[PDB]
């Protein structure tokens, strides 16, 4: 990072080496995944941090160490009913294999008769979503600090042939240093060609997903455009009461910007929210560098962000260990584990 500051572009061979070694590390774990590294009775379940279609994420306390973690619980029967087996196997296989400063760490995983469990580091600062809705919008420098972390994270993930496919503020957690931790690998997939699954979150879907066209990692760059817009405006570029109305707006690709957006921000967004794939930033000959070298990012020290050396725009409140003040309350429900093994064959590799 001194060389990148001293001579822009001079770091490119070193970044290439970093990524090559990162892929070696990833592939070892991808090829031989960790399995069965804890069990349910090792944790006290404290409070729900969020609910989803297949289960919930709970704050737990590891009994033996006293450490807090966030445990994602997935009901096997529902996963099977909704035809999400492969997605759930992808989620765990990928999350246990990655290693990057802005990706949540998976510490343990296991299954029992009823459920799958993924035990992650607890990121106590809450969802970006909560802070964004409360404050209204982020200033451009604040939005840019977060956006830079996502750019680097996608550079990392895409280099491993991974597509993320659910970027949104609800899946971005703020840590105790004010940096992002990406959670929710439910739609992450390792794919070298194109893929076809309609998945994501409506506001963030690229037109090529919507139109059942086949698509590639460029959908993550589109989603970055939506995220930057939403962070800086306070509302998404395509919103309505119902997904059908949102989809109509996305495929028009007409986007209107708040009058307070800078010229550089509007230009970056026109290039990310580009319906034409031959024109979308992140998907051109120079790849991620078209984004990293854009005028809006001129003040961004990419390597300093990676090293977490940049002062964060804010640090969330922290009352002590196990504090959930930065999260909404959810209805609690007793975890019941059946006496019969459910869906054993389907989840053998988990």
């Amino acid at each position: 990072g001194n060389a990148a500051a001293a001579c822009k572009g001079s770091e490119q061979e070193s970044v290439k080496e970093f990524l090559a070694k990162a892929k070696e590390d990833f592939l070892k774990k991808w090829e031989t995944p960790s399995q069965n590294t804890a069990q349910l009775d090792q944790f006290d379940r404290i409070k729900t941090l969020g609910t989803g279609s297949f289960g919930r994420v709970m704050l737990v306390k590891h009994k033996e160490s006293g450490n807090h973690y966030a445990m994602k619980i997935l009901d096997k029967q529902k996963v099977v009913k909704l035809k999400q087996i492969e997605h759930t196997l992808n989620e765990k296989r990928i999350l246990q294999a990655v290693n990057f400063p802005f990706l949540v760490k998976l510490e343990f995983s296991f299954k029992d008769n009823s459920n799958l469990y993924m035990v992650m580091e607890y990121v106590a600062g809450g969802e970006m979503f909560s802070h964004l809705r409360r404050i209204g919008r982020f200033s451009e420098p604040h939005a840019r600090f977060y956006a830079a972390q996502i750019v680097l994270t996608f550079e990392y993930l895409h280099s491993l042939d991974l597509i993320y496919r659910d970027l949104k503020p609800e899946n971005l957690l703020i840590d105790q240093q004010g940096y992002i931790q990406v959670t929710d690998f439910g739609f992450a997939k390792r794919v070298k060609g194109r893929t076809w699954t309609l998945c994501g979150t409506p506001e963030y879907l690229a037109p090529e997903i919507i139109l059942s066209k086949g698509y590639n990692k460029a959908v993550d760059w589109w989603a970055l455009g939506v995220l930057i817009y939403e962070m800086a405006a306070g509302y998404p570029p395509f919103f309505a009461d119902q997904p059908i109305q949102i989809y109509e707006k996305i495929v028009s690709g007409k986007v209107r910007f708040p009058s307070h957006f800078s010229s550089d921000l509007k230009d970056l967004l026109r290039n990310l929210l580009q319906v034409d794939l031959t024109k979308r930033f992140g998907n051109l000959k120079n790849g991620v560098n078209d984004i990293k070298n854009h005028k809006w990012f001129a003040t961004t020290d990419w390597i300093a962000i990676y090293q977490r050396k940049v002062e964060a725009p804010f640090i969330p409140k922290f009352k002590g260990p196990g504090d959930t003040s930065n999260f909404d309350d959810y209805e609690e429900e007793e975890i019941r584990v059946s006496i019969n093994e459910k869906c054993g064959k389907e989840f053998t590799e988990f």
Partner: peptide
């Protein structure tokens, strides 16, 4: 205002992922 239109809309809370 566009902000007022968003705040009055039905999708200002946490948004669930979708799939078919």
């Amino acid at each position: 205002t566009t902000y007022a239109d968003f705040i009055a809309s039905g999708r200002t809370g946490r948004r669930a992922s979708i799939h078919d």
